[PDB]
Motif scaffolding. Structure first.
Motif, PDB file in Angstrom:
ATOM      1  N   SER A   1       0.820  -1.209   0.000  1.00 49.40           N
ATOM      2  CA  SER A   1       0.000   0.000   0.000  1.00 49.40           C
ATOM      3  C   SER A   1       0.853   1.256   0.000  1.00 49.40           C
ATOM      4  O   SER A   1       0.741   2.088  -0.894  1.00 49.40           O
ATOM      5  N   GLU A   2       1.711   1.386   1.004  1.00 47.33           N
ATOM      6  CA  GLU A   2       2.563   2.557   1.122  1.00 47.33           C
ATOM      7  C   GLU A   2       3.407   2.794  -0.121  1.00 47.33           C
ATOM      8  O   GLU A   2       3.569   3.941  -0.528  1.00 47.33           O
ATOM      9  N   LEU A   3       3.943   1.728  -0.719  1.00 47.77           N
ATOM     10  CA  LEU A   3       4.767   1.871  -1.924  1.00 47.77           C
ATOM     11  C   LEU A   3       3.970   2.468  -3.065  1.00 47.77           C
ATOM     12  O   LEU A   3       4.517   3.195  -3.887  1.00 47.77           O
ATOM     13  N   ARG A   4       2.683   2.147  -3.126  1.00 48.89           N
ATOM     14  CA  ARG A   4       1.813   2.666  -4.175  1.00 48.89           C
ATOM     15  C   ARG A   4       1.489   4.119  -3.888  1.00 48.89           C
ATOM     16  O   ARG A   4       1.707   4.999  -4.719  1.00 48.89           O
ATOM     17  N   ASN A   5       0.976   4.367  -2.693  1.00 49.86           N
ATOM     18  CA  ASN A   5       0.607   5.708  -2.322  1.00 49.86           C
ATOM     19  C   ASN A   5       1.751   6.683  -2.521  1.00 49.86           C
ATOM     20  O   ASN A   5       1.518   7.871  -2.730  1.00 49.86           O
ATOM     21  N   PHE A   6       2.987   6.199  -2.465  1.00 52.51           N
ATOM     22  CA  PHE A   6       4.114   7.093  -2.689  1.00 52.51           C
ATOM     23  C   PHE A   6       4.090   7.393  -4.174  1.00 52.51           C
ATOM     24  O   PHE A   6       4.066   8.546  -4.583  1.00 52.51           O
ATOM     25  N   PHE A   7       4.073   6.336  -4.978  1.00 54.52           N
ATOM     26  CA  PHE A   7       4.034   6.476  -6.421  1.00 54.52           C
ATOM     27  C   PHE A   7       2.617   6.637  -6.941  1.00 54.52           C
ATOM     28  O   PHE A   7       2.088   5.798  -7.674  1.00 54.52           O
ATOM     29  N   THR A   8       2.016   7.742  -6.535  1.00 58.24           N
ATOM     30  CA  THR A   8       0.668   8.103  -6.916  1.00 58.24           C
ATOM     31  C   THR A   8       0.728   9.596  -7.105  1.00 58.24           C
ATOM     32  O   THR A   8       1.177  10.330  -6.233  1.00 58.24           O
ATOM     33  N   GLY A   9       0.289  10.040  -8.262  1.00 61.13           N
ATOM     34  CA  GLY A   9       0.300  11.454  -8.558  1.00 61.13           C
ATOM     35  C   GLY A   9      -0.543  11.583  -9.792  1.00 61.13           C
ATOM     36  O   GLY A   9      -0.398  10.783 -10.721  1.00 61.13           O
ATOM     37  N   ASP A  10      -1.434  12.564  -9.811  1.00 61.65           N
ATOM     38  CA  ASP A  10      -2.278  12.702 -10.967  1.00 61.65           C
ATOM     39  C   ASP A  10      -1.887  13.840 -11.881  1.00 61.65           C
ATOM     40  O   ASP A  10      -1.123  14.733 -11.506  1.00 61.65           O
ATOM     41  N   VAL A  11      -2.398  13.745 -13.104  1.00 60.27           N
ATOM     42  CA  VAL A  11      -2.168  14.708 -14.166  1.00 60.27           C
ATOM     43  C   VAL A  11      -3.479  14.835 -14.915  1.00 60.27           C
ATOM     44  O   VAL A  11      -4.247  13.877 -14.988  1.00 60.27           O
ATOM     45  N   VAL A  12      -3.734  16.013 -15.470  1.00 54.48           N
ATOM     46  CA  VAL A  12      -4.958  16.239 -16.220  1.00 54.48           C
ATOM     47  C   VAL A  12      -4.586  16.658 -17.618  1.00 54.48           C
ATOM     48  O   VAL A  12      -3.827  17.608 -17.805  1.00 54.48           O
ATOM     49  N   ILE A  13      -5.121  15.949 -18.600  1.00 55.77           N
ATOM     50  CA  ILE A  13      -4.818  16.250 -19.984  1.00 55.77           C
ATOM     51  C   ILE A  13      -6.092  16.382 -20.815  1.00 55.77           C
ATOM     52  O   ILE A  13      -7.096  15.712 -20.558  1.00 55.77           O
ATOM     53  N   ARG A  14      -6.045  17.257 -21.808  1.00 53.49           N
ATOM     54  CA  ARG A  14      -7.194  17.487 -22.670  1.00 53.49           C
ATOM     55  C   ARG A  14      -7.324  16.319 -23.643  1.00 53.49           C
ATOM     56  O   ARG A  14      -6.351  15.934 -24.284  1.00 53.49           O
ATOM     57  N   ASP A  15      -8.529  15.763 -23.743  1.00 52.29           N
ATOM     58  CA  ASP A  15      -8.815  14.625 -24.617  1.00 52.29           C
ATOM     59  C   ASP A  15      -8.402  14.831 -26.066  1.00 52.29           C
ATOM     60  O   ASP A  15      -7.756  13.967 -26.653  1.00 52.29           O
ATOM     61  N   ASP A  16      -8.809  15.948 -26.655  1.00 58.03           N
ATOM     62  CA  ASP A  16      -8.413  16.248 -28.026  1.00 58.03           C
ATOM     63  C   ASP A  16      -7.468  17.433 -27.929  1.00 58.03           C
ATOM     64  O   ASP A  16      -7.795  18.444 -27.322  1.00 58.03           O
ATOM     65  N   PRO A  17      -6.281  17.325 -28.535  1.00 57.67           N
ATOM     66  CA  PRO A  17      -5.276  18.387 -28.506  1.00 57.67           C
ATOM     67  C   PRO A  17      -5.825  19.690 -29.029  1.00 57.67           C
ATOM     68  O   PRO A  17      -6.768  19.705 -29.819  1.00 57.67           O
TER      69      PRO A  17
END
Lengths: 85, 48
Positions: free
Chosen positions: B2-18
């Motif tokens: 669990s902890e190993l994942r939660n460390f490597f967890t980070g979100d990004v938001v990208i536009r569907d169509d460029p």
């Protein structure tokens, strides 16, 4: 001549007056006023003799009054203006 | 784990169509309106 010719000229002299009144104390060094422009041009229209810029508007205006008094006095001259017609 | 994942967890938001990108535009201006006759303000000029 024609009574009309006299009125017309009177109106001119009477206009020259008006503008002389307008230009009094409004004659500055680097300015060009529509008023002074009018005036200086009217000063020209008086004398059939010459049309050069009038350096001293007193002169011709005087010559004109003098000529006039000398005319209006002698009945041999201004007689025609006293006819019924 | 669990902890190993939660460390490597980070979100990004990208536009569907460029985005559709364009080049600049030459700002050309052209005349409009109608012009009438304007007379000189001072009138006849003094002689000589």
């Amino acid at each position: 001549m024609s009574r009309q010719m006299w009125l017309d000229t009177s109106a001119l002299l009477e206009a020259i007056s008006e503008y002389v009144v307008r230009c009094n104390g409004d004659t500055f060094s680097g300015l060009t006023t529509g008023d002074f422009n009018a005036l200086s041009n009217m000063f020209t229209q008086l004398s059939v003799s010459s049309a050069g810029y009038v350096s001293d508007p007193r002169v011709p205006l005087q010559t004109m009054s003098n000529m006039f008094v000398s005319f209006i006095t002698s009945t041999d001259r201004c007689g025609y203006m006293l006819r019924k017609t | 784990f669990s902890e190993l994942r939660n460390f490597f967890t980070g979100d990004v938001v990208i536009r569907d169509d460029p985005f559709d990108v364009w080049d600049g535009v030459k700002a050309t201006y052209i005349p409009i309106g109608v012009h009438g006759v304007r007379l000189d303000p001072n009138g006849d000029q003094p002689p000589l």
